[PDB]
Design a protein around this motif. Structure first.
Motif, PDB file in Angstrom:
ATOM      1  N   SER A  46     -18.430  18.553  25.732  1.00 56.83           N
ATOM      2  CA  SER A  46     -18.469  17.152  26.138  1.00 56.83           C
ATOM      3  C   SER A  46     -17.682  16.940  27.424  1.00 56.83           C
ATOM      4  O   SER A  46     -18.197  16.383  28.400  1.00 56.83           O
ATOM      5  N   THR A  47     -16.426  17.385  27.444  1.00 57.53           N
ATOM      6  CA  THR A  47     -15.621  17.286  28.654  1.00 57.53           C
ATOM      7  C   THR A  47     -16.068  18.303  29.693  1.00 57.53           C
ATOM      8  O   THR A  47     -16.196  17.980  30.879  1.00 57.53           O
ATOM      9  N   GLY A  48     -16.312  19.538  29.271  1.00 58.96           N
ATOM     10  CA  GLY A  48     -16.637  20.567  30.230  1.00 58.96           C
ATOM     11  C   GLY A  48     -15.397  21.212  30.803  1.00 58.96           C
ATOM     12  O   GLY A  48     -15.144  21.093  32.002  1.00 58.96           O
ATOM     13  N   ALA A  49     -14.587  21.844  29.958  1.00 59.53           N
ATOM     14  CA  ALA A  49     -13.316  22.405  30.395  1.00 59.53           C
ATOM     15  C   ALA A  49     -13.504  23.812  30.952  1.00 59.53           C
ATOM     16  O   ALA A  49     -14.617  24.332  31.046  1.00 59.53           O
ATOM     17  N   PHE A  56     -13.859  24.984  19.985  1.00 63.72           N
ATOM     18  CA  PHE A  56     -14.854  24.450  19.074  1.00 63.72           C
ATOM     19  C   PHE A  56     -14.135  24.199  17.768  1.00 63.72           C
ATOM     20  O   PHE A  56     -13.433  25.084  17.281  1.00 63.72           O
ATOM     21  N   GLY A  57     -14.314  23.028  17.201  1.00 66.79           N
ATOM     22  CA  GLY A  57     -13.640  22.738  15.967  1.00 66.79           C
ATOM     23  C   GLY A  57     -14.123  21.480  15.326  1.00 66.79           C
ATOM     24  O   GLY A  57     -15.171  20.942  15.678  1.00 66.79           O
ATOM     25  N   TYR A  58     -13.342  20.999  14.370  1.00 71.92           N
ATOM     26  CA  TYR A  58     -13.684  19.809  13.618  1.00 71.92           C
ATOM     27  C   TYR A  58     -12.469  18.902  13.558  1.00 71.92           C
ATOM     28  O   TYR A  58     -11.337  19.349  13.715  1.00 71.92           O
ATOM     29  N   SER A  59     -12.716  17.616  13.341  1.00 66.77           N
ATOM     30  CA  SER A  59     -11.664  16.606  13.343  1.00 66.77           C
ATOM     31  C   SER A  59     -11.858  15.685  12.148  1.00 66.77           C
ATOM     32  O   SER A  59     -12.699  14.787  12.179  1.00 66.77           O
ATOM     33  N   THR A  60     -11.053  15.884  11.120  1.00 69.23           N
ATOM     34  CA  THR A  60     -11.185  15.182   9.860  1.00 69.23           C
ATOM     35  C   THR A  60     -10.581  13.786   9.965  1.00 69.23           C
ATOM     36  O   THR A  60      -9.940  13.451  10.956  1.00 69.23           O
ATOM     37  N   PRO A  61     -10.805  12.919   8.975  1.00 76.25           N
ATOM     38  CA  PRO A  61      -9.968  11.725   8.826  1.00 76.25           C
ATOM     39  C   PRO A  61      -8.695  11.934   8.024  1.00 76.25           C
ATOM     40  O   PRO A  61      -8.010  10.952   7.730  1.00 76.25           O
ATOM     41  N   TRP A  62      -8.378  13.157   7.645  1.00 80.11           N
ATOM     42  CA  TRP A  62      -7.160  13.391   6.905  1.00 80.11           C
ATOM     43  C   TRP A  62      -5.974  13.382   7.852  1.00 80.11           C
ATOM     44  O   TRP A  62      -6.113  13.509   9.067  1.00 80.11           O
ATOM     45  N   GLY A  63      -4.797  13.204   7.282  1.00 82.87           N
ATOM     46  CA  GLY A  63      -3.589  13.202   8.067  1.00 82.87           C
ATOM     47  C   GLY A  63      -2.538  14.039   7.392  1.00 82.87           C
ATOM     48  O   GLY A  63      -2.500  14.079   6.170  1.00 82.87           O
ATOM     49  N   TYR A  64      -1.690  14.719   8.143  1.00 82.99           N
ATOM     50  CA  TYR A  64      -0.746  15.639   7.543  1.00 82.99           C
ATOM     51  C   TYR A  64       0.691  15.239   7.838  1.00 82.99           C
ATOM     52  O   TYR A  64       0.986  14.549   8.809  1.00 82.99           O
ATOM     53  N   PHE A  65       1.585  15.675   6.968  1.00 85.38           N
ATOM     54  CA  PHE A  65       3.017  15.532   7.165  1.00 85.38           C
ATOM     55  C   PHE A  65       3.566  16.847   7.688  1.00 85.38           C
ATOM     56  O   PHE A  65       3.334  17.902   7.089  1.00 85.38           O
ATOM     57  N   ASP A  66       4.296  16.786   8.795  1.00 84.48           N
ATOM     58  CA  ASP A  66       4.827  17.985   9.440  1.00 84.48           C
ATOM     59  C   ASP A  66       6.328  17.817   9.630  1.00 84.48           C
ATOM     60  O   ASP A  66       6.801  17.462  10.702  1.00 84.48           O
TER      61      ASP A  66
END
Lengths: 104, 103
Positions: A46-49, A56-66
């Motif tokens: 999409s950006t063209g880096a 390449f990956g995925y982006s969930t609606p989950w959120g994590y504690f770090d």
């Protein structure tokens, strides 16, 4: 056990025993809604880096504690109290709690 | 007023003295005491072992304290140590008031 009852108390101690130190920390969080609940894939097309910056990956609606930085547990006095008279430290066990949930 | 622990019954004075060993007395009895002893001196070791009682701090200060540190630098001589010909030199007077209790 709500709704008119707190499901946990605020603990933010830091106790120094002989050969072990227990560093409690409690924070207030806020979790939004990510992606509007979608597993949108993410890539570089999409950006063209650059050639080394393609991904390449995925982006969930989950959120994590770090809690993976040292100042999430040690106040600067407790860090000073540690590093001045200690030849070493390692963690034994952790204990994670998540309470007083309010869903606005 | 010089600081310290005012004690009613302090540690007792330990007094030490070489027993006088006389030189040769004359053959006839004399009334006068002695004008001649054997010159002598003693040596030996002495151990003093004081048990102290400490008061551990109970602070909830956030920021770091001011504590007595050595000067971290390329120095000519290490402080509170011996010299090129063995003279123990204390460089500065060290107090004891470095921690902070609220009033």
């Amino acid at each position: 056990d709500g709704v008119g009852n707190a499901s946990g108390n605020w603990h933010c101690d830091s106790t120094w025993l002989g050969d072990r130190v227990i560093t409690t920390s409690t924070r207030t969080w806020a979790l939004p809604t990510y992606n509007n609940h979608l597993y949108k894939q993410i890539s570089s097309a999409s950006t063209g880096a650059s050639n080394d910056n393609h991904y390449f990956g995925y982006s969930t609606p989950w959120g994590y504690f770090d809690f993976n930085r040292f100042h999430c547990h040690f106040s600067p006095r407790d860090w000073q109290r540690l590093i001045n008279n200690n030849w070493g430290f390692r963690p034994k066990r952790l204990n994670f709690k998540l309470f007083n949930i309010q869903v606005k | 007023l010089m600081g310290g622990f005012g004690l009613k019954n302090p540690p007792p004075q330990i007094l030490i003295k070489n027993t006088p060993v006389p030189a040769n007395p004359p053959a006839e009895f004399s009334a006068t005491k002695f004008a001649s002893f054997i010159t002598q001196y003693s040596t030996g070791q002495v151990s003093v072992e004081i048990e102290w009682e400490l008061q551990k701090e109970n602070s909830k200060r956030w920021n770091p304290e001011v504590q007595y540190t050595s000067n971290y630098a390329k120095s000519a001589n290490v402080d509170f140590t011996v010299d090129n010909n063995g003279l123990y030199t204390e460089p500065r007077p060290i107090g004891t008031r470095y921690l902070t209790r609220p009033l």
